[model samples]
Target: MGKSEEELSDLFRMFDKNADGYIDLDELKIMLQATGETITEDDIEELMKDGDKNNDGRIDYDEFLEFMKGVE
Candidate 1:
């Protein structure tokens, strides 16, 4: 297990690079790639679209949390 929400939130902030309060393909890719997952652009685009609730091409904390809540 990891730390509390505060620590996880802090981690999210670090991963969110551009700091536009949201994260996009490049940012998400960087994070996953670091975990040794070689993701395809097509898959990344699909995930971005699914998480970008408002079609903004990026996903904010709320959007990410909402999307993750339903993760299988």
Candidate 2:
């Protein structure tokens, strides 16, 4: 588990509005836009390319933790 599981879970829940155990592109885009971060579809694809481990077009907790490591 990541060092900040609670923080990560909280952040993940914020993005995973549908509560489907994964953060899809639309949700991610919304969160980013909410934070005033502009992103293109290509940018989103690049992000998912790294974090979407199963190639299922969504980010799960484990993969999100890896991404959080960089953000923090």
Candidate 3:
């Protein structure tokens, strides 16, 4: 768990574009755009809702970790 958390933090930082300790949909959208993947606004909105368990409208580090874990 420790190793996984550390690695996931690295990925979390990647999406924390503003480096404000949280990832908003704008940052997440940009990350996906950078990947050149085919995703829409609805996808981004759903993704935000998916990770934002607390309904805070932001994906914090803990939320990010959980999201990554689910991906695996």
Candidate 4:
């Protein structure tokens, strides 16, 4: 099933620990670890670089949606 915007927004907020409207490297690492995925600092950098569709250097909700599409 496709995720509703509300549901995705909820998840987005959870990952945006600082409530800065974006998920930074440290935030991403925390989110990953919470999901039981152990990741290196390098992995967070790479994930943002690859999935940052707008190249703003952070994972916003829109970028997160794009990344989730690939995972699904």
| RMSD in order of candidates | 3.5, 2.8, 2.1, 2.8
Q: State each model's CA lDDT, in order.
A: 0.73, 0.77, 0.82, 0.77
Ranking by lDDT: 3, 2, 4, 1
Off by over 4 Å in 1: 1-8
TM-score (all chains, Cα) for each model: 0.67, 0.73, 0.83, 0.71
Candidate 1 pairs with clashing backbones: none
lDDT per residue, candidate 3, 4-61, as tens digits? 4578887888778988898788887887888998968888898888889899989888
C-alpha RMSD in Å of predicted model 3 compared with the true structure = 2.1
Among all windows of ten consecutive residues in candidate 4, which has the lowest summed lDDT? 1-10
- Measured by lDDT, the strongest candidate is 3
lDDT of 4 by residue, 1-72 (tens): 344666566667776897888878888787778889767999778877867889988887889877766543
* Candidate 2 Cα misplacement greater than 4 A, ranges: 1-4
Error of 1 at 36 (Å): 1.6
* Candidate 4 off by > 4 Å: 1-3, 32-37
- TM value for model 4: 0.71
Give the lowest summed-lDDT range of ten residues in model 2: 1-10
lDDT of 4 at 72: 37
lDDT of 2 by residue, 3-64 (tens): 64778778778768778888777777877888887778778778777878778778988888
Per-residue lDDT for 1-72 in model 1, tens only? 355455446655766877877868888788778879777988889888888898877787777776655442
TM-score of model 1 (CA atoms): 0.67
